Symmetry: C3
Subunit: 90 residues, 3 copies
């Protein structure tokens, strides 16, 4: 397995920019992605922003505590998945 | 590793609602997400609905057998991925 | 764990077709998916095509070297994730 892992975060559309701002400032991040998804929960549903953030496992706390700040008032579901391998094809 | 795992299901647009109906009724599920994706296969291609459903590993059978019903006549590709961790940031 | 694993590839919109062409020709692949995502990096951002390709771990090299060709001039981020299980519900 890998020291890299993927953080997936289901964020409300309003804290979207605040999240982007946080991430761009984190030096241990080489980049991230974001897409629109439809989300259900308890039921009621709606539209969110889905962020995917590859990061070193060693910086997991740093990453989650940083994001936990932007969500002070807007809870965000998240999950972390293992990555076997990552890189760049060329 | 985790007792939580992610079910990813590539469903045809017509059984989309039937799937939503099944999921909302499953008590061991706290919520789910769905998005539009383009899917290829054997080649011919098209547009599907991609569901992502976090659930306890212990309820995997319950979840798949329940969904297997709605797909009686519309086969759906799926895969299950491990989750190291999940929760809610605030 | 599984001998199947998921390749996730963040491709530029211009080599999108070239990638599709490569994949459709690979016999060990039963199908793949692709969706639009917004991607950041170092920061500057933009829109990409996100491919997800389930494949046997045994054919990982074959898959990456084949794709590495289409990206000769357009680098593409990628990652490989484990799959516990996969199939088709019906």
């Amino acid at each position: 397995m890998s020291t890299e892992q993927l953080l997936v975060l289901i964020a409300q559309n309003d804290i979207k920019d605040d999240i982007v701002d946080t991430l761009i400032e984190l030096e241990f991040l080489s980049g991230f992605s974001l897409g629109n998804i439809c989300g259900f929960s308890r039921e009621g549903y709606r539209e969110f922003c889905k962020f995917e953030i590859m990061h070193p496992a060693a910086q997991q706390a740093a990453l989650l505590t940083a994001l936990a700040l932007v969500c002070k008032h807007n809870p965000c579901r998240y999950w972390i998945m293992p990555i076997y391998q990552n890189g760049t094809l060329s």
